[PDB]
Amino acid sequence: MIVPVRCFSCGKVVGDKWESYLNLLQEDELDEGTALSRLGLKRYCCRRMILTHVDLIEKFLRYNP
Amino acid sequence: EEGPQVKIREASKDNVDFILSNVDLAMANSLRRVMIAEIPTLAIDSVEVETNTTVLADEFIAHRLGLIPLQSMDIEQLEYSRDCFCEDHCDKCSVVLTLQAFGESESTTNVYSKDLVIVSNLMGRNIGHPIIQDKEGNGVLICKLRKGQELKLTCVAKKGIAKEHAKWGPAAAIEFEYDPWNKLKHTDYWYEQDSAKEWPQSKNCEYEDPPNEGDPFDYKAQADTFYMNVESVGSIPVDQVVVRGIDTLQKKVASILLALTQM
Amino acid sequence: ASRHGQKGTIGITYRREDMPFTAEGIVPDLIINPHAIPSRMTVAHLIECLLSKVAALSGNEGDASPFTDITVEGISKLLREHGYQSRGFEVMYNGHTGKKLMAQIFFGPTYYQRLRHMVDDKIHARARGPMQVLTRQPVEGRSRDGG
Amino acid sequence: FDMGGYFIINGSEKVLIAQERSAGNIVQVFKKAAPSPISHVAEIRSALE
Amino acid sequence: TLSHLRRTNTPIAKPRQLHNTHWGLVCPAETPEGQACGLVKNL
Amino acid sequence: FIVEDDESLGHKELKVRKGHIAKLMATEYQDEYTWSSLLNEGLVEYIDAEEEESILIAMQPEDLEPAEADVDPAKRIRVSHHATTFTHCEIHPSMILGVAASIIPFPDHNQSPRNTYQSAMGKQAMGVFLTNYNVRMDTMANILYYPQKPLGTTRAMEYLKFRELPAGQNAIVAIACYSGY
Amino acid sequence: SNTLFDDIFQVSEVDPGRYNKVCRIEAASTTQDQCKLTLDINVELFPVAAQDSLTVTIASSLTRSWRPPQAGDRSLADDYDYVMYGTAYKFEEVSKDLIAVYYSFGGLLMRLEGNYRNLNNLKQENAYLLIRR
Amino acid sequence: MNAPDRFELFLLGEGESKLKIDPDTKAPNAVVITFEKEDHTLGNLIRAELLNDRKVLFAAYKVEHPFFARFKLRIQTTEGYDPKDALKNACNSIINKLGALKTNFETEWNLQTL
Amino acid sequence: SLHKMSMMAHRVKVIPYSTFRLNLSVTSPYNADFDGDEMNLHVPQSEETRAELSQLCAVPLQIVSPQSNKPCMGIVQDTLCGIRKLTLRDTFIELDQVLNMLYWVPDWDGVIPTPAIIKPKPLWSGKQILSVAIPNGIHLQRFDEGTTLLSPKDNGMLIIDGQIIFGVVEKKTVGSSNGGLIHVVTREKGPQVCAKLFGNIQKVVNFWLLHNGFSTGIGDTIADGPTMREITETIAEAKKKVLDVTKEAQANLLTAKHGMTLRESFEDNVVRFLNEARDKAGRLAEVNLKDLNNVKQMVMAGSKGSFINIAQMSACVGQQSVEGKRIAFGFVDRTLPHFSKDDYSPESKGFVENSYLRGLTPQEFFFHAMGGREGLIDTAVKTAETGYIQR
Amino acid sequence: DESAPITAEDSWAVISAFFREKGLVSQQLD
Amino acid sequence: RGNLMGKRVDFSARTVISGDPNLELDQVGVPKSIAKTLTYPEVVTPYNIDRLTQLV
RNA sequence: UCGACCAGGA
Ligand SMILES: Nc1ncnc2c1ncn2[C@@H]1O[C@H](COP(=O)(O)CP(=O)(O)OP(=O)(O)O)[C@@H](O)[C@H]1O
Ligand SMILES: [Mg+2]
Ligand SMILES: [Zn+2]
Ligand SMILES: [Zn+2]
Fold it and tell me: Which of B101, B192, G74, I51 could form a disulfide with B151 if both were Cys (CB 3.0 to 4.6 A apart)?
């Protein structure tokens, strides 16, 4: 439900990364793992942040008013 | 040159990897803590909502807003709101931001940290500007809008430390290590068969020498030489996360010494 | 609680500085007691953690499906290939001093659940208040501000 | 994601819980306790579908 | 919610115990703890 | 799955073959050959608890269907296919479980009641319950700010829509003794 | 303030019973035949292998809080490598003219069995232990 | 709800001093300084440097409860040395040491090309 | 509230945050855990009612219990696990830390004790500075296995004048044991003196352990490769031992020991060979586990866990039981529809050949599931019956 | 092959196809 | 049994419990909320008179 | 402001 700004654990701004992460997988047909490190996500605390997030915001937007 | 020496291995706009030679562990760690909490940053700390036709909760967004990094360069030339003399805030103690967003497009219109805009006067000091490290130049997605989904906010960002809220954290994660070959015997490695073969050797093993088997234990041995990596989130540039970490800690020690003079 | 009947409440909340850290600057979000595991025999909790550690590094979904051919020895082999100690242990340093902890901590991700039992929905004190009509004794429940 | 399979009664989501009963028209022999004038019994729960 | 729409109730020899025949029909772990333990079944 | 001695090309084998298995997946990517298809082709059947008494079931198809004439020490100790008389084969043994038990990572590596416990707690866990939560006027609704799908997952979680509507977060758990809090 | 015992011993066996930093050493005296020793030694700071000439001294002094350095000008009564401090906790009469005294240096035990040092050894806690070479 | 304010971790309250210097009855030339609104960031550090002061006989520090930003420090000195004078000296050395770090870091940083 | 001890008088300490905070060693008399337990507080209104509590009901008074003629509270969990770790002859503390450890004792005499080792580095023993929490005139003697006034195993216990002379401190000393330190301080020194000893052991042990650390990983269940083959063949030789007694009883040669059918007598032997098996198979693993095994280290101090806890995790779970008998034929002459009829084999009637680390087979999983359910039922059924008995 | 026998992982395609057609509230509705 | 052998009572409190190693054996951590609702009725005596006024 | 059912907590 919308990408968290900053990783809970160490606080690296994971916020901007999302759109670019989705585009690495779709467009650059990269595997999730390589795509993650390409955005610069080195530690697994930051890595889970993106890798394990479920963007429910997109579902909620589907509701008209 | 002086007391404790320093050797910068690698450096960037957001990461400094150095070696702290000729120091005590306590000092090397006190510096770690200071960088984490005690350095002052600027962060959104009041979100006045006007309209929220969004799928998201006002407070969800409000929390989310503070967590956005803002230029904290000339922070030291800004009073803590609490110390200023105005009722609430002003230009001497606070930076005011304004966010207006509306879904004009049929396609999902997004709100970015770039979309916030300074309404207060900066008095000619590098502060307030939201940090955009983004390749595309947007940086941090606040939230998304549909059709007539509107969002109007006014934000007041103030000086503060991470010891009050982690949003005022100027640093990401400080990598810290000493004695890669366990020569100081500060660990008793858990093993199944061979401790040395089971445990991976850190990158720092090249910066020190392997102990040599037939060499007895050095009970006199002490740990100086600490391999560190300070990572900046963006608010303050890496060099300053270190420099201000050193000045803040100095000031803390100074206050004690100074308080002892009133006594 | 974890997905293993490993329930607990928070004792204390610590900021990052006082928290024990890996040489990589990674710190825990949560610290559970080693004492939980031996009596309870909740091996899967530890296996979840070793697999979830790998999953986070590799960016591949960890199959924690029951009747499979996934071994703890097999997961170890991958984690070692990721440059970590095969059984999930990691050396840690004390938050207060900075001195390496004599012991190496089993550290990694674990799916934790927020349960509906939050203290401020339970906490209650009554020192004289509403009385029952008939019995003339205190009323029942925090709801009615009873004793 | 809502699966259904329940009712909305006076604006309240009500779920009908399955009820475990013993099958009927089923022939079943059981032994009687130590102090009983009957040693065994054949029972049939005869009911119309 | 999913598990609520898949819940079974037993009113009233050793019914609380997990019988062999429950194999693949009823969940062997999903049951309440005490006073209704093994009476409330989950498909 | 129905198992037949009727297999001209050898021994006794599961009616359902690689053909059918792919035939299904084509209809899966097309999102003709449904569940009812296997039922009407008589490859799969409905066995009640009474009928269960007159049949012989193999747990695994492949692991309980060939013959014999080194081994991995890491794997668990398993039984043979000494049964010539196999009538049916279990689709997947993990289907003995219900909704709750199916969210448990490795329940085969736990003490029996610890699973029973979690098959109660997951119901008392927060998270997204429906995406229309914002348009419902229910008394009390608890929603997790940032849900995360788990890293350790079942093949069964798929069908349960769990990784789409999660129960918690993948927290960084350290099993240590700290301040004794 | 004076010496209470001195003899040159020799190791027979060094044993680490599941112990990484310590060992129990078994010794015999070159001086007297009747004199034997058993002693737990921190082999981390003082490594001992079998058949080593170890001059073992006991002595009363050289009771108030502990002062760490300044010893530069202080009388370092240690012209010995190893120095321990402990308590006499048992005085065994191992029959006839033989007497065994038990010492503990905070868990690190000791048992000196012999004869001549009857008078010399006192059930009084205050005892040091000096080992050279 | 029963949550104390966060600024209570550093902002000194109404009538509350940073240093409370009390003499220790237990031993001679001993003292106990209560550092208000402080943690191990300062504690362990001051304690450490005091140990190097050869004229300091005893230095230890404790944070009796983690709800409270405050810790105690026990200083014992050689007769004639005011333990206050010992703490006063220990701070200056820390400051000079840190000054050297800032000086050494600044110069070595300016040398980098990234 | 099934105890005199289930309700005790306590001093208030007004703290922030919404929970009732309580000392961990008073956990046992209440039988409280911190997994979401709630507790009741009652405020006396009279100056005479206050006295009633402070003079009869106070926690220090409740320390030695008259139902067992022993202390109802001792040192638990972290502090117990860490007290063993701190004690053992290999543990040595250097000056910098020793001084912090001493300051932590609120009743420290202000005297820095003479270090056990002076030679190059002045080092203190774990036992040495733990003895700072132990008050003078406390004399205790134990003797366990081969404890010989020079205990080579660091066996038993010897404390003279409130000073540890030899042996490790674990459950048998610092716990709620009959002859243990608590019952001794409470008797010799007093109730408020003992209530202090509790805190002072904790303040030191907890601190030391904070700076030493303790953990548990999957590595603690992992048994050695050759040891595993050894366990696996121990099961095999016992399953072959069963098969023997099975085909022999089928050949009508068996002879039943009085008050039992051939069937009843046979079933005893099956159960026996398979339980002998699990236990010896388990013992191989415990024996193969190093002193560094965190799980072994908890069983050792007596903080948490036992032999069977190791055995089932590392080696093998073993036989499953419902109503005393091994999983019986709920279906006709077969335990599940995955078996042929008249199968009496370990696998059929619920024998779990596997360890929890290895993982369970679907049949083993279901049989364990039936046996486990029996536990929850008995806890529920017989809990009211037991309650009415008290009433 | 169209006749080659099914594997272990193959079973999940049948399970996929089960719920794809049955659902989870199957029983309640039917 | 329900009204005379056992009663609902005033001057009572209940909340979630947590373990503290920095507490005395005989202490109990009382949340300020709870301390502020529960009350002890103290008699105005020359011994307390001055303190009591500052509380009122 | 009354008490019944249901669902839960240790
Ligand atoms: N129905 C019931 N009636 C009375 N008391 C109960 C109860 N259910 C639980 N309790 C109380 O809770 C105590 C133990 O239950 P729990 O705390 O839930 C298990 P645990 O101690 O957390 O872990 P464990 O399962 O490893 O023992 C009992 O001793 C009892 O005091
Ligand atoms: Mg509990
Ligand atoms: Zn991170
Ligand atoms: Zn202002």
Answer: B101
